[PDB]
Design an enzyme around this catalytic site. Structure first.
Site, PDB file in Angstrom:
ATOM      1  CG  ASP A 123      -2.194   0.952   1.018  1.00 40.84           C
ATOM      2  OD1 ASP A 123      -2.394   1.638  -0.016  1.00 40.84           O
ATOM      3  OD2 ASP A 123      -2.936   1.059   2.013  1.00 40.84           O
TER       4      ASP A 123
ATOM      5  CG  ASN B 177       1.927  -6.559   6.421  1.00 43.19           C
ATOM      6  OD1 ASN B 177       1.362  -6.511   7.513  1.00 43.19           O
ATOM      7  ND2 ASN B 177       1.402  -6.022   5.314  1.00 43.19           N
ATOM      8  CD  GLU B 178      -2.373  -7.281   5.179  1.00 47.38           C
ATOM      9  OE1 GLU B 178      -2.302  -6.566   4.163  1.00 47.38           O
ATOM     10  OE2 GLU B 178      -3.332  -7.258   5.968  1.00 47.38           O
TER      11      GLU B 178
ATOM     12  CG  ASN C  49      -2.610  -6.640   9.294  1.00 47.94           C
ATOM     13  OD1 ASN C  49      -2.190  -6.603  10.448  1.00 47.94           O
ATOM     14  ND2 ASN C  49      -1.813  -6.554   8.236  1.00 47.94           N
TER      15      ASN C  49
ATOM     16  CE1 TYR D  95      -7.440  -1.486   8.224  1.00 42.10           C
ATOM     17  CE2 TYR D  95      -6.478  -3.632   7.688  1.00 42.10           C
ATOM     18  CZ  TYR D  95      -6.332  -2.305   8.097  1.00 42.10           C
ATOM     19  OH  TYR D  95      -5.082  -1.781   8.376  1.00 42.10           O
TER      20      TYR D  95
ATOM     21  CE1 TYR E  57      -8.922  -2.206   3.841  1.00 46.03           C
ATOM     22  CE2 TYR E  57     -10.005  -0.854   2.173  1.00 46.03           C
ATOM     23  CZ  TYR E  57      -8.922  -1.087   3.005  1.00 46.03           C
ATOM     24  OH  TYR E  57      -7.837  -0.200   2.992  1.00 46.03           O
TER      25      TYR E  57
ATOM     26  CD  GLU F 176      -1.873  -3.482   8.864  1.00 42.49           C
ATOM     27  OE1 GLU F 176      -2.774  -3.263   8.019  1.00 42.49           O
ATOM     28  OE2 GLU F 176      -0.729  -3.883   8.556  1.00 42.49           O
TER      29      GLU F 176
ATOM     30  CD1 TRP G 211      -3.508   1.126   8.175  1.00 46.37           C
ATOM     31  CD2 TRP G 211      -1.685   0.288   9.165  1.00 46.37           C
ATOM     32  NE1 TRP G 211      -2.483   1.169   7.258  1.00 46.37           N
ATOM     33  CE2 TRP G 211      -1.352   0.665   7.846  1.00 46.37           C
ATOM     34  CE3 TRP G 211      -0.692  -0.266   9.978  1.00 46.37           C
ATOM     35  CZ2 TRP G 211      -0.071   0.509   7.324  1.00 46.37           C
ATOM     36  CZ3 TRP G 211       0.584  -0.422   9.452  1.00 46.37           C
ATOM     37  CH2 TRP G 211       0.875  -0.035   8.130  1.00 46.37           C
TER      38      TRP G 211
ATOM     39  CE  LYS H 255      -7.871   1.611   6.182  1.00 46.11           C
ATOM     40  NZ  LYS H 255      -7.345   1.855   4.800  1.00 46.11           N
TER      41      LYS H 255
HETATM   42  O1  LIG Z   1      -5.248  -0.869   3.395  1.00 40.83           O
HETATM   43  C1  LIG Z   1      -5.016  -0.524   4.588  1.00 40.83           C
HETATM   44  O2  LIG Z   1      -5.743   0.229   5.293  1.00 40.83           O
HETATM   45  C2  LIG Z   1      -3.896  -1.224   5.322  1.00 40.83           C
HETATM   46  N1  LIG Z   1      -4.333  -2.608   5.634  1.00 40.83           N
HETATM   47  C3  LIG Z   1      -3.401  -3.684   5.546  1.00 40.83           C
HETATM   48  O3  LIG Z   1      -3.789  -4.797   5.882  1.00 40.83           O
HETATM   49  C4  LIG Z   1      -1.962  -3.512   5.097  1.00 40.83           C
HETATM   50  O4  LIG Z   1      -1.125  -4.200   6.024  1.00 40.83           O
HETATM   51  C5  LIG Z   1      -1.568  -2.052   5.177  1.00 40.83           C
HETATM   52  O5  LIG Z   1      -0.338  -1.957   4.434  1.00 40.83           O
HETATM   53  C6  LIG Z   1      -2.641  -1.211   4.497  1.00 40.83           C
HETATM   54  O6  LIG Z   1      -2.164   0.169   4.427  1.00 40.83           O
END
Ligand SMILES: O=C(O)[C@H]1NC(=O)[C@H](O)[C@@H](O)[C@@H]1O
Ligand SMILES: O=C(O)[C@H]1NC(=O)[C@H](O)[C@@H](O)[C@@H]1O
Lengths: 596, 596
Positions: B165, B407-408, B461, B463, B467, B499, B544, B563
């Protein structure tokens, strides 16, 4: 049915667009069972009408509500109303409305953006107060226009999902009114205006007068009779005309008279004498090539979801005028008729569009768009009906130079053609006097689209350099030019880019002229302009979007759609001055010579 | 290479990081061919080092540059450094550097986040000026960490593509120093701490004396010798403990003395007596339950890109301290070692991470992620190599509790487990003292994810609500809980949320508390908190991001990434006060009552 626009003379209006009505949600959907129209609405708060209901109360849950809501109001029939034809009319009720005059159901309507009315004479007594309950529904499905799918979760709580890029605002968005006519009444007029190298022409009339003989007279702006007609149905007028023209829009007036043996009815219809025609790659108005400038607009503002407002209209037109816009398209739904009256009066050219957006499942569950599950024979009938009601409404507005049947259907599947061919034909029967179009989505490009040959003018929505080749003006420019030339050679129609624009956060400034910055918006429009001027088939440019507007929530929309030239409070972004220079710098209605 | 943090005792360094170097782009890729390193760079301009080259010039064409850039600088060697060992050290050169000293090629490096050094005694004359030239390459490919693909256009120029990202900032990001040592010296150390129940316990040294014997005395903060060994290769030291604790972070000092006939080299190291291991569902700090608070962070700021800056470092720590952060993760690349000394010294907890992000093709052209086409053995080596260099650098920093191997990565494709099992192996051996992790993406969830079992701590991580379940706190909460619980079952491993975050426009305010509004950030962070608490397995929260930071251009990123709890200019969003209140209303290093 038939729709004439309420004017006063013999005929009279009570507004009842007086705004304060009782309002409640019907979360349980008890409302019809319990006949809420039978007494005063219970647990009801004050609401303004005309207006969306969603934003009026700064409450997320009312905003995101799906299902039935109730408006209630008591009103006084004018004493003098006596034995006249009394009619109750709604200029719009968003998505669905069912109306009761005192425990008497008088009308029902599916369509969020066109008027419905019922003769209420028998159901009301003049000099007495009546209760009016409207049950309004904001739900969309595969047969609604525009389409959607309500999802009910495990708890039986509804949630509306839909496929278009504006917010599903609902409620009584426009004037509701009570109005009068004699028992002999004019209720349909159709005027067609012909012109022949602009020295002379004929204006045909077609008139439906509920039980009356009709006579016709045509008057100047300075009010002198320049032609007459009997042939109460089909009467043709010859004239040495002041043509209704993009710059000024000179308006004649046609007076329609319905005479009964004892009764008179008088209807004035404003008329602009103008011809609209496509010839090859040109769009001709009064036999001259025209070049569109201006915007795709929305009906959107703070605190009113889509509610009509006069100040907003006066203001936006001052903006459009200042910036040198000569046109717009009623993006994604029919607009308030006041807008078309304005356009007629000021000589603004308009592309009139149905609410038929969201036919697309790939914009960004059913696997076939044209499907019994999803877009089907019922939808097509609902679509045709939408076309009918729009044309019935707007047929006499000289500002309307074209009908747009739909915005951005997915035309890739076989069946898109199956579905659209009959609508194209039907539309032309409905109005022979205007070019027809279906606005085209980026991914149905010149090589993959299956539908565009069936319409008269090519209207493209293009976002190269934004959704694709992101940030890259250089390759954006190549793809755009190559695409437009492909279309030209493919169809040899006039091309209007009905959408081009980039999200721009007002106040975001960048030296790197990269995405979401005022400077990128400037450079990107500028590049698009450079290309337009190199392509002879390009006949028009309508920027997306006049102003920032609300959408559904998601990762792609920062508090909404930011492609406005102005913000939602009508503040100019720097691109507004850029457009001002290009548009006021051109010869009016004329295409640049592909150099400064 | 062997890796030690240069420090000043009998040893001296002159920073050439005195900033103004000569700078040039090699657009024509002539640089190597013409031995540009032999003469003053022409068409040169001043640039500051330490700093990214991209944003120093407010030029898009330089910002988006892919290929070789040239850094040149002249430096007078000090007169008292004459038969001493001289080492040229770069703490980081982003992606790739090639160094010359007056037409003498001295070193090469792949990896933009770790130091590389070489002895230059033979090529440099003391009291004279030597010319330093560096070739810096920013290109990323499949063999690189993190990976990318570079496309050469139809016109011939290069454009970089990558899958992480944050923005691809390149240039000399960290300091460059000339570096002195006696002809006999130390170039390696290693230390371990054992502490059983906070009674007195031991620190085992292991050292490398490049031709000397060592006396190895441990000093207290008061320079009071509390233990000694002479076994320059292996020892143990034991006294009443005085723990390095996360509250205050007390440190000891280990003088490493290395003796030759003519020369003695005293090297100093700092030691924090503390213990880190997992027991079931718990991350224990010195045999005691720790609960992480703080951030995922980046190295990003306004005009320096990822270039180090003391003022920025002082300021950011003031803010983390103020807000109650006890921990952060070096997001997606290893940070400047200065940051780790600060954490060592102030007792901040650090999840250290390699630059291995973007293994995934689903985040938002090759068919198989793990394949000769995409990620292969060669790629597994560099991954290994990157992990080697990290641990080589940070193995001695007490603030590092845990390695984050990557990471990821997308673990759904075939071979994901084959890929990560051996690297997991190699790392556990490389540092047995610290737990090891791999940070997991949302779409590789409990049921779908392979390769979670090879790691000691679960770093997630997540969301939901942003998302997916976009804007829906209610469903997002359930998905999140069921998700987190589904995680306690599959494994009973310590869970840290590495995150959790939402884009939020500073100044966007809403009564509707919807996406991209300050309010939403608050409500959402609040919601994760209520869930977080209920799960016994949850050992930590890392929001995050700490602050807004740049990303490559696209429709999903408005300023860049938004973020941040603070804006890029370090101004707090309302959510900074939400976190403040929770993270200081807690007991230190502890979990809330799954209620108030
Ligand atoms: O898209 C994001 O909000 C973040 N989420 C992630 O899972 C990634 O680890 C980050 O790099 C990214 O910036
Ligand atoms: O995404 C956009 O910015 C716009 N593009 C389109 O192609 C649609 O026609 C518009 O509704 C939409 O708002």
């Amino acid at each position: 049915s038939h729709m004439l626009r309420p004017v006063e003379t013999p005929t009279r209006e009570i507004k009842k667009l007086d705004g304060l009505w009782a309002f409640s949600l019907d979360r349980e959907n008890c409302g019809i069972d319990q006949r809420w129209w039978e007494s005063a609405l219970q647990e009801s708060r004050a609401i303004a009408v005309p207006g969306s209901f969603n934003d009026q109360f700064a409450d997320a849950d009312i905003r995101n509500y799906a299902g039935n809501v109730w408006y209630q109001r008591e009103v006084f029939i004018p004493k003098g109303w006596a034995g006249q034809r009394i009619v109750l009319r709604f200029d719009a009720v968003t998505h669905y409305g069912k109306v009761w005059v005192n425990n008497q159901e008088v009308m029902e309507h599916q369509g969020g953006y066109t008027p419905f009315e019922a003769d209420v004479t028998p159901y009301v007594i003049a000099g007495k107060s009546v209760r009016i309950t409207v049950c309004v529904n904001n739900e969309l499905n595969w047969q609604t226009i525009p389409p959607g799918m309500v999802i009910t979760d495990e708890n039986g709580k509804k949630k509306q999902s839909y496929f278009h890029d504006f917010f599903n605002y609902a409620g009584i968005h426009r004037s509701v009114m009570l109005y009068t006519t004699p028992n002999t009444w004019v209720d349909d007029i159709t005027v067609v205006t012909h012109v022949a190298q602009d020295c002379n022409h004929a204006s045909v009339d077609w008139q439906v007068v509920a039980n009356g003989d009709v006579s016709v007279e045509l008057r100047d702006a300075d009010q002198q009779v320049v032609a007459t007609g009997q042939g109460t149905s089909g009467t043709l007028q010859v004239v040495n005309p002041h043509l209704w023209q993009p710059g000024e829009g000179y308006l004649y007036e046609l007076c329609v008279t319905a005479k009964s043996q004892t009764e008179c009815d008088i209807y004035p219809l404003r008329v602009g004498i103008r011809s609209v025609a496509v010839k090859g790659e040109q769009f001709l108005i009064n036999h001259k090539p025209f070049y569109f400038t201006g915007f795709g607009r929305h009906e959107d503002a703070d605190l009113r979801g889509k509610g009509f407002d006069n100040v907003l209209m006066v203001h936006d037109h001052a903006l459009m005028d200042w910036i040198g816009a000569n046109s717009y398209r009623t993006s994604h739904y029919p607009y308030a008729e006041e807008m078309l009256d304005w356009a007629d009066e000021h000589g603004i050219v308009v592309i009139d569009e149905t609410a038929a957006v969201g036919f697309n499942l790939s914009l960004g569950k059913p696997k076939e768009l044209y499907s019994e599950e999803a877009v089907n024979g019922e939808t097509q009938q609902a679509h045709l009906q939408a076309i009918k009601e729009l044309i019935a409404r707007d047929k006499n507005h000289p500002s309307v130079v074209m009908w747009s049947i739909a915005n951005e259907p997915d035309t890739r599947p076989q069946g898109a053609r199956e579905y659209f061919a009959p609508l194209a034909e039907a539309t032309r029967k409905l109005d022979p006097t205007r070019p027809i179009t279906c606005v085209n989505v980026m991914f149905c490009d010149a090589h993959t689209d299956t539908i565009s040959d069936l319409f008269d003018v090519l209207c493209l929505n293009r976002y190269y350099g934004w959704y694709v080749q992101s940030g890259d003006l250089e390759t954006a420019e190549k793809v755009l030019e190559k695409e437009l030339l492909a279309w030209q050679e493919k169809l040899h129609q006039p091309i209007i880019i009905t959408e081009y624009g980039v999200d721009t956060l007002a106040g975001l400034h960048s030296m790197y002229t990269d995405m979401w910055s005022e400077e990128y918006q400037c450079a990107w429009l500028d590049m698009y302009h450079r290309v337009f001027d190199r392509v002879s088939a390009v006949v028009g440019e309508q920027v997306w979007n006049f102003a920032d507007f609300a959408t559904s929530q998601g990762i792609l929309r920062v508090g909404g759609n930011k492609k406005g030239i102005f913000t939602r409070d009508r503040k100019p972004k720097s691109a507004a001055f850029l457009l001002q220079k290009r548009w006021t710098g051109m010869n009016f209605g004329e295409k640049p010579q592909q150099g400064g």
